């Protein structure tokens, strides 16, 4: 990328945006694999480079606008089928508006070709290609940042239910590298309802780059059968790369996320490069994490059609050995709205995903409940809250029992522990390796939860009738409850409610009431 030595604020550090970015692997900056990296500074940056998009590749343009049409920035003037998954939407660059005096015909083109001309109100004729440039450090503009509402549906029960992410929200995952972060990040990347993923996947393990070039091209997008790379764009930070570029990769990544957002996609920006992101010569250097995160959001995009896209941020905080106290841990956890706390004791106990349901939190619960209530069910919030109360109850009881023992525990309390344990095992625990349980649709989540909480209501009902707890604990329907996560037919899961009720009736019959 040649550029120019301009005054102001650096060279004018930017990125190219157009067809073929997808399936591609880039560096703090935007050059293909194993390419030298430029220095930084508050004042300026110097870069010796290669090309970011092939000028030599031929793309099938489908125009969507005509000679005579009025346009504004964000308006979509045609389409380019880019991968087998993603249509690339060709948009007037921000700040350009006017009349389309000239537009290409449906045909094949390389990116330097001019596919349209726009006459601005001044009369100035602006020439538009299939790509555009943007300064990575300026947030691409939009009409309006919408308040957090709809959830980013992850298909993971513990997250979607107890610690929800909003489309356009900010989330962090910290804890040990040990058990499960990788598989959990991988589950999020492939299952979350974001059409496009930008992964800043950046050498935290010496063989990570090897795994990236060797494995990533084989991964399938479970929604289509096709490769996950065909909706992904990677941004590597490594130990050989300049402190400079490593710094700037988040911007390059978020800029590219905003660009797919602007077309109306939901996009997930995933950062898993904690350590490589380090600097030498702090408050002065922390509002630089703040504003990066401020760039997350669901927005009504620029353009003449009403159009919504989003960028959801999920940041890894994996500090090596135990850098968990001071850097990226004071400023970052108080800026993110959601935190999924991976916990090595849970992992050792083989509870997966190993997410600690007492130290994680989401501040999007009330923001997303209405979306759940309107479509998934009307009792979604009441039910999570009830299931959490019972988990909080369990945790208190277990502390108490650690001190004084279990033998003087009353039936009611034993019942609470039995049901909480069913919550942990049936719902909290989810099998990423199983062909059904690797994804749990919204409808299935609420039904499994109703089955569980109905069993709780009947348990507490039975006990307050003199049915003993040992009899409840061996209801056959219990063990079907432990398997419901493996059932793909949601209506079979649902039938467990009536089945539970009936077995209880016939425990009421044995005994009294």
Swiss-Prot record:
CDD domains referenced in this protein's UniProt entry, alphabetically: ATP-synt_V_A-type_alpha_C (cd18111), ATP-synt_V_A-type_alpha_N (cd18119), Hint (cd00081), V_A-ATPase_A (cd01134)
Post-translational modification, as annotated: This protein undergoes a protein self splicing that involves a post-translational excision of the VDE intervening region (intein) followed by peptide ligation.
Alphabetized PANTHER family for the sequence: H(+)-TRANSPORTING TWO-SECTOR ATPASE, V-TYPE PROTON ATPASE CATALYTIC SUBUNIT A
Catalyzed reactions: ATP + H2O + 4 H(+)(in) = ADP + phosphate + 5 H(+)(out)
Function: Component of the A-type ATP synthase that produces ATP from ADP in the presence of a proton gradient across the membrane. The A chain is the catalytic subunit.
Protein name listed in UniProt: A-type ATP synthase subunit A
Compartment(s) where it occurs, according to its Swiss-Prot or TrEMBL record: Cell membrane
Similarity comment: family membership: Belongs to the ATPase alpha/beta chains family.
Any Gene Ontology CC annotation: plasma membrane
Gene: atpA
Gene Ontology terms: biological process: intein-mediated protein splicing; intron homing; proton motive force-driven plasma membrane ATP synthesis
Record keywords: ATP synthesis, ATP-binding, Autocatalytic cleavage, Cell membrane, Endonuclease, Hydrogen ion transport, Hydrolase, Intron homing, Ion transport, Membrane, Nuclease, Nucleotide-binding, Protein splicing, Translocase, Transport
Record lineage: Archaea, Methanobacteriati, Methanobacteriota, Thermococci, Thermococcales
Annotated InterPro entries: ATP-synt_VA_C (IPR055190), ATP-synth_a_Xtn (IPR031686), ATP_synth_asu-like_sf (IPR023366), ATPase_a/bsu_AS (IPR020003), ATPase_F1/V1/A1_a/bsu_N (IPR004100), ATPase_F1/V1/A1_a/bsu_N_sf (IPR036121), ATPase_F1/V1/A1_a/bsu_nucl-bd (IPR000194), ATPase_F1/V1_b/a_C (IPR024034)
